[PDB]
Write a protein that binds this ligand. Structure first.
Ligand SMILES: CC(C)(Cc1nc(-c2ccc(O)cn2)no1)C(=O)NC1=C(C(=O)O)CCCC1
Lengths: 337, 56, 294, 216, 233
């Protein structure tokens, strides 16, 4: 009622006051002395040309060589990036897939989409074929992002405005995170695999502690739908790319907006964002059919990745940081170095 | 009922009961980590093709 | 006069001033027009045709056939300069005839293939042939290319040039007496593709109007495009064949002993052979220049 | 230069590519239809003859139609509506009896405006089904059409009101040139509805073929 | 589970045209390359033939090239070996080893039960040096194996495997690519080395390690096995 509305009013007022008090000067003033990275060499080393339809998600294995890609033709394709060979081809029960994951151990993969079911496939079997290890259900909306914590614990983001930490051995939601008011369209796991950020459709991102489950911090400032989130390699920050043609950097300590990567030239939103191994370069896939890589410190366009006919949908960087890979809406993935 | 307002109040009050770190020093260790680990980042520094796995 | 029994055929060839009077300008215009038209055609098809579908593949092969065709013109142009003489030795004369033969064939075959593809895409929409891989289109096109090379290599294997009186000649369609597969295959590659073109066009028009699709403007313009393709094919490749059967008629009636009757008709025949190169410059215009895309 | 194991891996990759190509060829001949309604407009009634998304497969005249009923997807439509970009047609169903509902036809018009005038469906045709025609007759025999339609000048006649509703739903389209709207006063009747869809689908396919030939 | 049953044994008069069959039950047999490997009684293993998945690539040993035929029947999950013009040295145990080739795979992981065939009356040379070393439980011994050509490839992986033949049953895979330890095998077996010199230790060796240990090359066909090392006591 009215008094609860008023305490919420004063609580967010004092939160904003503390945020502004903890702000003295933008880090653009602290970073202008650093020599800019300049124009970045970018070439198409390999071109994975196996898909036959729209490509919606991808992920890099921890070996930095095998990558799994998901397309609307209902096929999960696991490629050896070094030789562009197709290690595996998995038929999906539901052809509508928008998320994909690769287990840290490499034994399992995850997939999901409009079926509201997260399917976990076992990659290493004595039968010599991939099989659907376990289907997880309980999400009332479409699955947008799923990430592996280990061989047995997964965390999934759905369109039901809630996230869920599951248990593949048993198949029930071990924990449920319900703090959002819109579709949660992305997910990122911190390096320690204890905290994770989720950017939803209410133009806000939220930080959750997977150990027990509750929204530790809420970050706002976006003017439209948030389509991608990605942790900083240090783990004390993250970057969110949204539909308003802006990428934004937040930290888990100051809990404030840091940088607004945007330009008057581009107006299309962001589909995927990922950092580099050192975190100096921040890549962002756009609807303008090209991926812009920005200096994470200078807020300047370090380079342009223009080799895709259609809109870039998924983007990933290998664990060793040796190369990046973009899967656009055309049937081709591309590897850049 | 208005239990959702109570949940929002708990969310906001817990978010208020946290320690906030000065933004300038956060950026300080941010770009400190950045320059410390920029040495072994092939994306930033063009790696020679001798040991580039994607040399093709 | 004439009846120089070129090989053993018992017969006559003529050279007249009207050739160098009328042919040079018209084939000069065809020359330049073909150069620029097929230039943009191949430029778009090589650097601006990322789609690269089966019909696009057939159109590109027609384009390359027409491009080689409009590059053969300068050598037969220079030949027309010196009143049916020849100067460039033996090897490139045979090269000119083989190029010109197998090209005009290639065009005809690819034009017919495009027509058949349109017929299947309209009349039989739910057919596998409508949606085929680019590999299948490439294989079929290469097979047709091999067909036209195989039908026409017979003249390549020859000391093509002929003393044309005191001068030289490389005309092969020198019109005399006996039956040969070349003029027979030339009449066949006009007649049978003519029937295929008309059957495909009639089926397309009848199916489109029977399904009441004639309302959307692009459909009407498609109807006009099919009509103009058929009409240009017939106006361009018909005069040559009707003249050809005219010499065949005058032959099986009179024979190759009184050649004064064929004094003019063969000249007329080379004017009609102009139209066969003349059609060339429509092939960019009516197929992939006035089309919705580019 | 590749070793024996690498050669065998390349052979396996080639076999996987062949299987992928075969599956793509098999799927490319299947017609996809996106079904949309209003929950009670009669999607079940349309699908009766043949927790997330629902897929229905049915064969007619050696043609395999796949219909994707989104149904209970209670999320942001614009977030996943681009997944269906490329379906052959959009079967939009609506009940004519809903003019005395909720106002419900106003919501149906709003949904039709959103779907038809969407950047993704700039070329996909919409097949509009108007069911409950008998219920429409029963309601119009007692309830005047002007209740939901203040700007209507006509009598309580089925044909006139039905034609007005069809015309007004049709003119909600903005790209009247590159996209067509097909309408059919469906009922229990017989497989006629399916026949209608087939015809419309064939139409779309024909146009698509003429688009591949660049001559459209 | 995975099961390979081999049949077509017995005694054949020399120069016959017999046949060997191998039925598979328990895995996707259509996507597995299959190897036929013989073993003369008091000798070491020797690779006879191999056929890839899809029957697109077939290889034979030089000793039996042109005399043996290999084929697959995927619908009924069977592997056929046509025997032609048999001679005395063809008398051997036979195995229907399976192998799947992709990045990180473990070829030669499972072995068939074996079938007897008794007939009346540029290759890499792989040497295992010592053939019989006496051991006691609780010890640790470094079995060594030597090759002529350097098995290390430009890729960076040494294509070499070692297997164990315990008394009275089929051989089993121990280590694949000289480093990666195969599934089911305990960590006690560990192998390493370099080109043309490969070693392994059985950390805390005990019983059920008795048998003959074979090192095998896989750089290119044909594949040559070692003489085998006999462990006793
Ligand atoms: C066309 C022809 C007869 C060359 C030729 N074509 C074939 C042939 C064979 C098989 C087949 O399927 C199709 N064609 N055989 O010979 C020839 O004399 N050419 C030149 C004229 C021209 O080409 O217009 C202009 C004047 C200079 C001479």
């Amino acid at each position: 009622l009215d008094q609860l509305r008023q305490e919420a009013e004063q609580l967010k007022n004092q939160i904003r006051d503390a945020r502004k008090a903890c702000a003295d000067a933008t880090l653009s003033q602290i970073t202008n002395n650093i020599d800019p990275v300049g124009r970045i060499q970018m070439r198409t080393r390999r071109t994975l040309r196996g898909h036959l339809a729209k490509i919606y998600a991808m992920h890099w294995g921890t070996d930095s060589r095998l990558l799994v890609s998901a397309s609307q033709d209902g096929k999960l394709i696991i490629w050896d990036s070094y030789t562009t060979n197709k290690v595996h081809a998995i038929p999906l029960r539901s052809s509508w897939v928008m998320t994909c994951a690769y287990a840290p151990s490499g034994n399992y993969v995850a997939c999901g989409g409009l079926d509201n079911i997260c399917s976990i496939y076992n990659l290493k079997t004595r039968e010599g074929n991939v099989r659907v290890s376990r289907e997880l259900a309980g999400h009332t909306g479409y699955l947008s992002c799923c990430r592996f914590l280990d061989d047995n614990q997964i965390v999934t983001s759905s369109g039901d405005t809630t996230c869920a930490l599951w248990d593949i051995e048993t198949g029930q939601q071990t924990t449920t995170f319900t703090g959002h008011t819109g579709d949660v369209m992305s997910l990122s796991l911190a390096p320690d695999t204890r905290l994770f950020v989720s950017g939803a459709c209410d133009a806000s991102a939220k930080l959750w502690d997977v150990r027990e489950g509750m929204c530790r911090q809420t970050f706002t400032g976006h003017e439209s739908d948030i389509n991608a989130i990605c942790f900083f390699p240090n783990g004390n920050a993250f970057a969110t790319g949204s539909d308003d043609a802006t990428c934004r950097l937040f930290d888990l300590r100051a809990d404030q907006e840091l940088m607004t990567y945007s330009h008057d030239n581009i107006i299309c939103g962001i589909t995927s964002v990922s950092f580099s191994k050192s975190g100096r370069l921040l890549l962002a896939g756009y609807d303008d059919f090209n991926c812009n890589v920005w200096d994470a410190l200078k807020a300047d366009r370090a380079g342009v990745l223009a080799g895709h006919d259609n809109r870039v949908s998924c983007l990933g960087v290998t664990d060793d940081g040796m190369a990046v890979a973009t899967g656009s809406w055309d049937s081709f993935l591309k590897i850049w170095n | 009922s208005i239990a959702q307002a109570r949940k929002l109040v708990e969310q906001l009050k817990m978010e208020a009961n946290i320690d906030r770190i000065k933004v300038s020093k956060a950026a300080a260790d941010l770009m400190a980590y950045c320059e410390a680990h920029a040495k072994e980042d092939p994306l930033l520094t063009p790696v020679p093709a001798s040991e580039n796995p994607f040399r093709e | 006069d004439h009846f120089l029994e070129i090989d053993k055929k018992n017969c006559c060839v003529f050279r007249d001033d009207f050739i160098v009077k009328v042919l040079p300008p018209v084939l000069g215009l065809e020359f330049i027009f073909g150069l620029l038209g097929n230039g943009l055609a191949l430029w778009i098809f090589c650097f601006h045709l990322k789609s690269w579908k089966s019909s696009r593949i057939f159109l590109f092969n027609l384009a390359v056939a027409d491009f080689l065709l409009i590059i053969c013109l300068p050598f037969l142009m220079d030949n027309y300069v010196r009143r049916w003489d020849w100067k460039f030795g033996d090897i490139p004369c045979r090269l000119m005839l083989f190029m010109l033969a197998m090209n005009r064939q290639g065009s005809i075959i690819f034009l017919t293939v495009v027509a058949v593809d349109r017929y299947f895409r309209v009349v039989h929409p739910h057919h596998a042939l409508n949606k085929i891989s680019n590999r299948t289109a490439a294989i079929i096109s290469c097979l047709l290319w091999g067909i036209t090379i195989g039908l026409t290599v017979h003249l390549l294997k020859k000391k093509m040039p002929i003393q044309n009186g005191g001068a030289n000649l490389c005309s092969s369609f020198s019109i005399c007496h006996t039956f040969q597969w070349h003029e027979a295959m030339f009449l066949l590659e006009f007649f049978l593709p003519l029937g295929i073109i008309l059957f495909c066009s009639a089926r397309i028009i009848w199916s489109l109007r029977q399904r009441q699709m004639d309302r959307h403007a692009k459909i009407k313009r498609a109807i006009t495009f099919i009509m103009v393709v058929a009409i240009v094919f017939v106006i361009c490749f018909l005069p040559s064949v009707v003249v050809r059967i005219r010499i065949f008629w005058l032959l099986h009636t009179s024979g190759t002993q009184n050649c004064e009757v064929y004094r003019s008709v063969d000249l007329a025949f080379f004017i009609t052979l102009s139209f066969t190169y003349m059609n060339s410059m429509l092939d960019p215009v009516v197929y992939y220049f006035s089309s919705p895309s580019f | 230069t590749l070793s024996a194991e690498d050669k065998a891996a390349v052979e396996r990759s080639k076999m996987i590519d062949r299987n992928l190509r075969e599956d793509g060829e098999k799927a490319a001949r299947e017609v996809k239809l996106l079904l949309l309604g209003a929950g009670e407009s009669g999607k079940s009634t349309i699908v009766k003859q043949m927790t997330g998304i629902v897929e229905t497969h049915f064969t007619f005249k050696d043609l395999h139609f796949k219909m994707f009923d989104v149904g209970a997807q209670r999320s942001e439509r614009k977030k996943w509506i681009h997944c269906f970009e490329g379906v052959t047609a959009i079967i939009f169903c609506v009940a004519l009896s809903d003019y005395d509902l909720v106002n419900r036809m106003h919501e149906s018009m709003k949904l039709f405006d959103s779907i038809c005038n969407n950047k993704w469906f700039t070329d996909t045709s919409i097949i509009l089904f108007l069911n409950k025609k008998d219920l429409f007759e029963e309601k119009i025999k007692k309830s005047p059409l002007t209740i939901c339609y203040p700007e209507y000048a006509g009598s309580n006649t089925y044909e006139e009101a039905a034609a007005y509703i069809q015309c007004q739903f049709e003119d909600l389209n903005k790209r009247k040139d590159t996209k067509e709207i097909y309408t059919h006063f469906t009922c229990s009747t017989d497989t006629k509805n399916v026949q209608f869809v087939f015809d419309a689908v064939t139409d779309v396919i024909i146009k698509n073929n003429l688009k591949d030939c660049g001559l459209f | 589970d995975v099961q390979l049953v081999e049949s077509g044994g017995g005694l054949v008069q020399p120069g016959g045209s017999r046949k060997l069959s191998c039925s598979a039950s328990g895995f996707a047999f259509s996507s597995f390359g299959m190897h036929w490997v013989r073993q003369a009684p008091e000798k070491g293993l020797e690779w006879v033939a191999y056929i890839s998945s899809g029957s697109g690539t077939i290889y034979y040993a030089d000793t039996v090239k042109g005399r043996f035929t290999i084929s697959r029947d995927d619908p009924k999950n069977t592997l056929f070996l046509q025997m032609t013009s048999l001679r005395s040295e063809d008398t051997a145990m036979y195995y229907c080893v399976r192998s799947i080739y992709y990045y990180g795979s473990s070829p030669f992981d499972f072995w068939g039960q074996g079938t007897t065939l008794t007939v009346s009356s540029s290759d890499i040379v792989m040497t295992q040096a010592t053939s019989s070393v006496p051991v006691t439980p609780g010890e640790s011994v470094s079995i060594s194996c030597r090759s002529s050509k350097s098995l290390l490839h430009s890729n960076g992986n040494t294509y070499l495997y070692w297997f164990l033949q315990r008394p009275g049953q089929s051989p089993q895979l121990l280590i694949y690519r000289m480093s990666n330890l195969a599934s089911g095998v305990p960590d006690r077996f560990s192998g390493s080395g370099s080109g043309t010199a490969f070693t392994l230790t059985i950390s805390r060796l005990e019983a059920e390690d008795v048998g003959v240990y074979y090192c095998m090359q896989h750089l290119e066909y044909p594949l040559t096995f070692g003489a085998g090392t006999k462990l006793e006591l």
